[PDB]
């Protein structure tokens, strides 16, 4: 029987998944995806590509109704009629959105056709993760919608400029993405919440801090300068893991982001210093200048500018630590290639190989000293650079 | 070891998939999908939803370039710069597109960083299937993009009319979808190619034709099979092919432009081409089977009822209306049948219908269900046989 | 849960087994055995070796009670008390033998503690297969019981003689096994039934008869001489598969075996000719002289004698076809190595590699022309030999 | 492909076995065994039953030669002729034995036709485990070989007496097994080594000692634990090791020859050695736990009852008899607990007992079951706690 076979497959894959770590589970999940694609019929492939786009449209509707937050707090299964009446939604519309949501595990449907939270329901109720989904709907989707015609119009160029990519046609403007976003109040607020989403694991899981420090002394220097550090999660985790390391630990960002960070920052030990990383770096001779998920959002020439603003502040002991994606030369996975297409369409930037990172840093007069990977199989690493 | 466990999982699923039929493989594929969603991390969920949308956009770029057709014809792996130079694409952009494509199996990357066709490559090179991908990008995507704020602005109504749903907001018009497409020279040609993609399997694989014929005579000159809105007439062709000795007229009904397009692929005899708008009374009297495949799902109840009412006065006691369409279950419906429901709600104002909802609709037309013959699994397509009440 | 895991393993292995042929199932079964051995604890290994010997002792008890034949014909589950009363067995003894039998699948026990036939029950009810089990108990077991002390007494020799191996000590006689068996009425009868067990598949599944024949003509020669052919299954299958091939087809065996074969032989087309294969072969110039599972039961010197009795009867077109086990040089499996130990202990003989077969046939002046394997992964093959 | 499917099965089972505990692995192993029996052909069944008996005989030969101990010590693979020449075995015979051994994993054959130790090699080199294999060959095998014709000759009786079962026919004597072994200089030494094999896990892994102590005082000088027929005293050693601070005498009771043999391995203090035949009244009064591990299963009901009756008059209200033994289920019992039942029936006239049969036996001694603490799965061994009625 196929239902018996299918239940047995689920049981054994679940038992294998439970017995490995999060990296082994990510590898199993990538293999399940590749098996699905290789096994589908030609018609299934067209259907899958046609319909998987429903997921984020329906998630955005659930978010606007407050459905995922509400269902996450319910202690018992809820009927479609109870959800519809509580949330201000038409009853037949609510019933057919829940039926779609249950079919892709956005919620769970019970045997008596009621609804409970799934793991995905809990995810979409988290503010930072909800904001990532809403960001995909309102900012990424229109740009991907414009990419095919944009490339055809321009005879398939190598996109290298943030001010002439798919973004400009999608939103009918000559501004680049980041500047245009800063003039849109509702989108600014959503990105503010997006910053509260802390990625796990982080670089401190594999970064050999003591061996990189060596005999460095804080005789009143900065140990860690978090450039564009957002909520300062890197500073918070650093002070939490090495609470007796001397040296200033400084969060650098724009004033509005720094204000939103004050609530969750510790009252002691981490300075909030407003700084635009398109300007010369004010902190001189720091041990670590840290750039996490910054340079991936800029083309080569402006990513170079950012590093050139830091280099004149470095001493011989100073290091620029680039914490970012490092996809492989071969066999890159969908999370790191889909990234690449999205940031080319919206920002004109790109993901870069280890060899691509080294070539960019050499234009700044830097040399790679060490690379400390901390996620698998999609590669994120802390890359430590020195003066040439 | 982690690599060897992954490779062992792949080998065992492959072997199990090879050990069953297409319905068993579709069930396995749905199970693998369920497993993925249940095992992803919270961040993976958001990433998956953010990035899976790239597949349709990049497929449209590859279709614009003719990449899929070209690589399908290739006998040896090709480098990114060979592909770029041949198709007229920037070398950097081509390498980035191929890397993404390979990551989602839209093509395959070899150990030497060259590229081969995959099953998906082959699929996207087929014109009828290519056209469904292009239809989803240019027609379905804008409607889904407009749906959330349409529902918000309108305070989440129950959509029931084809001229007031998300489609009107998405394309800034007041026509319904089918009217509007007819006035669009840009998009009609793709819809015409879409009719050429014959779905497999079809209802004849399980339809007990001889049993359903029962006490019915083709004499003197009666119609066996009237295929209402039959498009290219696939149903008529497969019917004559499977039952070449059964007497009776076999009639393809559609609009004159579609019938003209069907002439190239119809047999020279045995199948009549009859122009007929199914919003008017059915002209063929007393046929055995009045056949409607994937017609009624595109209409709200009121218009779907009128289409059935156009047929009923032509029926004799031994006539049957055969509705060949999706029949999702009361619970546990699959993503392919719920996804379609959202899409046709947003574009057409219509809906998928359960067996009970089909019977309720047909009751208003004075019909009763005599039999239901499923022919796909686990997503249910079925030939439903209705008679006069 | 372990019961859910264990049920899922069963489901998936069963589905894989159903989807291959009998050779793939044999390979899966060998892998399950090797996995069991590698996974057991040290205590499990001693227990397994201690207790798996119960299986054939309890099978012999079930055979003597007629239990397997009786249960094979029952249309409903039977209680231990009903089986005990019907078969003339003590009720508590019957209950604990059935509990042991059910634990090793010799029968199946139901949820309400009744008993039904298993696949193994049906097997043990077949006369020829029952006789194989009874043969293992009464003839093989005592010889294996004597092998360790026999080898120690004699300082671990290379056993090469049928008249001085473990058999002589086990049954306290100086006769060789076959001669001693012929003086034991009850054992003669059991081997008579053992001959009715036809092995499947057989050599005709892969033997290219027409291409081996070539232009041979029966102008009034024998096509097939089945030497020690037993019930003549090889002759029956040959006439059934090639019913229009001209040439005599002759079953050669001892008179008592030939009598028992007459019942099941066709009335036409197969001659029954009494012949002792330790004597010169009477049929001259036949196309195929066929020896299936004969030479494995003799040491080299008497296996050579048997072939030397046939060679002077051959023409240039004649072939000796040895149908027997051909184990590999490396990675031989338990069915073909356990064989080897048993026949060395009882008969002084051995299994032989392809290279070992060629060297034996060369002493007879024969050369291997072709080898047609027909079972996997345990190798049985029809080996075709020509005059040197 | 058939090879790759086999290799994938092996990898997945290995990974599942590694992903659970020893009890999960024992369940997996029983499942693999069930699968094999259900998937074998009729001819395979007969072959398996014919040939699996070779394993014990060949293990005994390897033990006689010291093969398992030698290969266990070896740092590199060894050829058959190196092994033959070193152990004093004919080169032909050695190669044939090793080929068979490798086929059942008793050692492993390398790709270059050389031989390494396996887990089973290691096992058979351990003296206590070696001794169980030798015991099965020389003591159990002759009794099983005599059982069928013994039952036939005697018209299939219910065996209930230790001096009239298959053992008397197998060894042509009228003594019971335990008496007869004591008069056999050949076989006593192996039985002595058998006592040194400590089973794992043991009852202390789940026994809630502090809970069972309850309202009981070691003062003034009471006994915590009396291990009746305790052999080498493993139970006493592990008890003092796990509960080093719990007060009370810990007493090992056995026959003087076994106690002498236990002296080498006992701690210098904390455990008393008390000669005592458990067929006589128990001398230690008012102990908390009177412990009987794998004692009573070797006796028919009548003698097992007498052993319990020897203990009851020594008990106080807070005293408990702890029977540590096998407790097979009412249905679905495993081969390791049913196989033992046949073996001890044939040699000792005794039996395995379900929980209900244990309670019935103890009721005749005036005892009631207070608690049962299982410590192995799926084959059930349990510490059963009995109190006065
Ligand atoms: C990827 S987000 C947060 C990255 C941060 N390193 C982390 O891992 O959480 C990029 C950050 O850069 C900040 N940013 C953007 N433009 C900036 C600028 N010109 N100067 C300083 N920070 C800027 C944003 O406020 C945002 O917090
Ligand atoms: C889903 S498509 C083809 C369905 C077809 N039965 C099949 O299974 O291939 C719907 C068909 O209905 C036709 N159609 C649309 N409106 C129609 C009308 N008013 N009268 C007749 N046919 C119509 C279209 O031309 C198209 O061929
Ligand atoms: C392995 S059994 C049957 C083999 C037979 N080729 C088959 O495949 O069924 C061996 C046969 O050889 C026969 N046999 C034993 N000694 C013989 C002899 N001296 N002359 C002729 N046949 C003999 C026995 O009667 C028995 O039928
Ligand atoms: C199964 S062995 C050892 C059991 C021990 N409780 C254990 O778990 O290791 C049985 C023990 O009972 C002892 N024994 C046999 N007869 C006895 C008797 N009459 N009185 C006391 N001990 C006896 C033997 O010496 C042997 O040590
Ligand atoms: Cl026909
Ligand atoms: Cl303690």
Q: Could you tell me the residue ranges of all domains in chain D?
A: 2-125, 132-194, 203-331+352-388
Nearest CA in chain B to C14: B16
User: The tokens 């993503």 sit on which residue?
Assistant: B335
Closest of B100, B106, B102, B95 to residue B63, by C-alpha = B106
Q: What angle do CA D61, D64, D69 make, to 5 degrees?
A: 100
Residue among D229, D250, D308 whose CB has most ligand 4 atoms within 8 A, to mutate: D229
B230 CA from centroid of ligand 2 (Å): 6
To the question of whether residue D157 is assigned a binding role by annotation, the answer is no
Which of C5, C6, C8, C12 to probe the A interface (max A CBs under 10 A)? C8
Would an 8 Å CB–CB cutoff place B25 in contact with chain A? Answer: yes
H or E segment and range at residue B359: helix B355-364
H or E segment and range at residue B342: helix B335-348
Q: In this structure, are residues A116 and B32 in contact, taking their beta carbons and an 8 Å threshold?
A: no
Q: Which ligand is nearest to the CA of B247?
A: 5
Residue A266 burial class via C-beta count within 10 angstroms: exposed 0-12, middle 13-18, buried 19 and up: exposed
In Å, what is the CA distance from C349 to each residue of C160, C169, C306, D13?
A: 7, 17, 14, 39
Residues in B touching C27 (Cβ below 8 Å): none
Residues in D touching A12 (Cβ below 8 Å): 12, 16
Closest of C93, C254, C268 to residue C188, by C-alpha = C254
Would an 8 Å CB–CB cutoff place D186 in contact with chain A? Answer: no
Peptide bond into A285 cis (omega under 30): no
B232 CA from centroid of ligand 2 (Å): 9
**Crossing angle of helices B2-18/A22-39, nearest 10°?**
30
User: The tokens 């919440």 sit on which residue?
Assistant: A193
**Residue B16 to residue C18, Cβ atoms within 8 A:** no
Long-range contacts of C53-56 (CB under 8 A, 24+ apart): C53/D52, C53/D53, C53/D56, C53/D136, C53/D140, C53/D141, C53/D144, C54/C100, C54/D144, C54/D339, C54/D342, C54/D343, C55/C104, C55/C106, C55/D49, C55/D52, C56/C133, C56/C136, C56/C137, C56/C141, C56/D49, C56/D50, C56/D53
Domains C2-125 and C203-387 share a fold: no
- CA C170 – CA B4 distance, rounded (Å): 50
Interface of A with B in 96-115 (CB under 8 A): 96-97, 99-100, 102-105, 109, 111, 113
D243 CA from centroid of ligand 6 (Å): 3
Give the CATH architecture of domain C2-125.
Answer: Orthogonal Bundle (1.10)
Bridge-partner residues for C387, per DSSP? Answer: C366
Look at ligand 4, atom 18, and give the residue with the nearest C-alpha. Answer: D277
- CA A324 – CA B84 distance, rounded (Å): 29
Would an 8 Å CB–CB cutoff place B15 in contact with chain C? Answer: yes
Peptide bond into D220 cis (omega under 30): yes
Residue among A178, A253, A296 whose CB has most ligand 1 atoms within 8 A, to mutate: A253
Closest of A86, A26, A369 to residue A214, by C-alpha = A369
To the question of whether residue B233 is assigned a binding role by annotation, the answer is no
DSSP-derived 3-state class of residue B371: strand
Q: In this structure, are residues D197 and D265 in contact, taking their beta carbons and an 8 Å threshold?
A: no
Tokens of A83: 């959800």
Rg, C-alpha atoms of chain B = 23
- CA D302 – CA D315 distance, rounded (Å): 21
Chains with 3 or more CB pairs under 8 A to chain B = A, C, D
Task: Report the 10 Å Cβ neighbour count for A195.
Answer: 18
Closest of C85, C185, C69, C74 to residue C125, by C-alpha = C69
Nearest CA in chain B to D14: B5
Region at D214 (left for phi over 0; alpha for psi -120 to 50; beta for the rest)? left
- CA B330 – CA D374 distance, rounded (Å): 46
Q: What is the CATH number of domain B203-331+349-388?
A: 3.40.50.150
Q: In this structure, are residues A354 and A326 in contact, taking their beta carbons and an 8 Å threshold?
A: yes
Q: In this structure, are residues D340 and D352 in contact, taking their beta carbons and an 8 Å threshold?
A: yes
Residues in B touching D4 (Cβ below 8 Å): 11
Return the DSSP state at B366: T
H or E segment and range at residue B370: strand B367-374
Would an 8 Å CB–CB cutoff place D31 in contact with chain A? Answer: no
3-state secondary structure string across chain D: CHHHHHHHHHHHHHHHHHCCCHHHHHHHHHHHHHHHHHHCCHHHHHHHHHHCCHHHHHHHHHHHHCHHHHHHHCCCCECHHHHHHHHCCCHHHHHHHHHHHHHCCCCEECCCCCEECCHHHHHHHCHHHHHHHHHHHHHHHHHHHHHHHHHHHCCCCCCCCCCCCHHHHHHCCCCCHHHHHHCCHHHHHHHHHHCCCCCCCCHHHCCCHHHHHCCCCCCCCCEEEEEECCCCCHHHHHHHHHCCCCCCEEEEEECHHHHHHHHHHCCCCCCEEEECCCCCCCCCCCCCEEEEECCHHHCCHHHHHHHHHHHHHHCCCCCEEEEEEECCCCCCCCHHHHHHHHHHHHHHCCCCCCHHHHHHHHHHCCEEEEEEEECCCCCCEEEEEEEEC
Interface of D with B in 204-263 (CB under 8 A): none
- CA B62 – CA B67 distance, rounded (Å): 5
Residue B20 burial class via C-beta count within 10 angstroms: exposed 0-12, middle 13-18, buried 19 and up: middle
Residues within a 6 A CB radius of ligand 2: B 195, 229-231, 234, 254-255, 258, 277-279, 293-295
Look at ligand 3, atom 23, and give the residue with the nearest C-alpha. Answer: C228
In Å, what is the CA distance from D111 to each residue of A90, A158, D8?
A: 71, 54, 20
D210 CA from centroid of ligand 6 (Å): 9
Which is it for the CA torsion C84, C90, C92, C96, positive or negative? Answer: negative
Q: In this structure, are residues C65 and C88 in contact, taking their beta carbons and an 8 Å threshold?
A: yes
- Closest partner CB to B32 (pick from A32, A333, A335): A32
Task: Report the 10 Å Cβ neighbour count for A114.
Answer: 16
User: The tokens 């750039």 sit on which residue?
Assistant: A291
DSSP-derived 3-state class of residue C176: coil
What class is the D203-331+352-388 domain?
A: alpha beta
Ligand 6 ion: Cβ-proximal residues, 5 Å cutoff: D 243, 245-246
Cα torsion through D148, D154, D157, D163, rounded to 10: -90
Resolution of the experimental structure, in angstroms: 2.1
- Resolved by: X-ray
Helix ranges, chain C (H): 2-18, 22-39, 42-51, 54-65, 67-73, 80-87, 91-103, 119-125, 127-135, 141-153, 166-170, 177-181, 185-194, 209-213, 233-241, 255-262, 300-308, 334-347, 354-363
DSSP-derived 3-state class of residue C252: strand
Chains with 3 or more CB pairs under 8 A to chain A = B, C, D
Q: What is the CATH number of domain C203-387?
A: 3.40.50.150
**Residue C140 to residue D53, Cβ atoms within 8 A:** yes
Return the DSSP state at B279: T
In short, whether C228's Cβ falls inside 6 Å of ligand 3 is yes
Q: How far is C362 from chain D (nearest CA, A)?
A: 21
């Amino acid at each position: 029987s196929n239902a018996e076979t299918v239940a047995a497959i689920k049981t054994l894959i679940q038992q294998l998944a439970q017995s490995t770590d999060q990296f082994g589970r990510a590898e199993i999940n990538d293999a399940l995806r590749e098996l699905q694609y290789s096994l589908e019929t030609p018609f299934d492939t067209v259907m899958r590509m046609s319909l998987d786009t429903c997921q984020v449209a329906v998630a955005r509707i659930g978010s606007d109704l407050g459905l995922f937050k509400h269902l996450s707090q319910c202690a018992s299964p809820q009927s479609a009629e109870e959800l519809a009446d509580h949330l201000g939604c038409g009853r037949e519309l609510m019933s057919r959105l829940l039926r779609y949501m249950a079919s892709v595990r956005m919620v769970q449907q019970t045997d008596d056709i009621k609804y409970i939270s799934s793991n995905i329901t809990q995810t979409l109720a988290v503010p930072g993760l909800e904001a990532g989904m809403r960001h995909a709907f309102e900012n990424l989707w229109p740009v991907l919608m414009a990419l095919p015609d944009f490339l055809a119009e321009r005879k398939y160029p190598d996109i290298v400029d943030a001010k002439d990519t798919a973004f400009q046609k999608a939103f009918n403007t000559d501004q680049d993405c980041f500047h245009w976003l800063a003039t849109q109040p509702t989108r600014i607020a959503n990105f503010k919440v997006l910053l509260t989403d802390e990625r796990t694991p982080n670089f401190l899981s594999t970064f050999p801090l003591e061996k990189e420090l060596g005999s460095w002394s804080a005789e009143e220097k900065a140990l860690f300068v978090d450039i564009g550090g957002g909520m300062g999660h890197a500073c918070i985790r650093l002070r939490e893991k090495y609470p007796n390391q001397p040296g200033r630990v400084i969060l650098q960002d724009l004033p509005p982001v720094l204000q939103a960070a004050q609530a969750t920052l510790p009252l002691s030990g981490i300075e909030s210093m407003p700084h635009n990383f398109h300007t010369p770096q004010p902190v001189q001779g720091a041990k670590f200048y840290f750039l996490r998920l910054i340079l991936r959002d800029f083309p080569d020439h402006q990513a170079l500018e950012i590093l050139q603003n830091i280099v004149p502040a470095m001493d011989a002991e100073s290091r620029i630590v680039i914490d970012d994606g490092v996809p492989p030369e071969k066999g890159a996975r969908w999370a790191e290639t889909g990234t690449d297409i999205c940031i080319m369409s919206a920002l004109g930037s790109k993901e870069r190989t280890q060899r691509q990172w080294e070539e960019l840093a050499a234009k700044a007069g830097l040399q790679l000293q060490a690379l400390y990977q901390y996620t698998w199989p999609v590669v994120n690493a802390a890359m430590v650079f020195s003066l040439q």
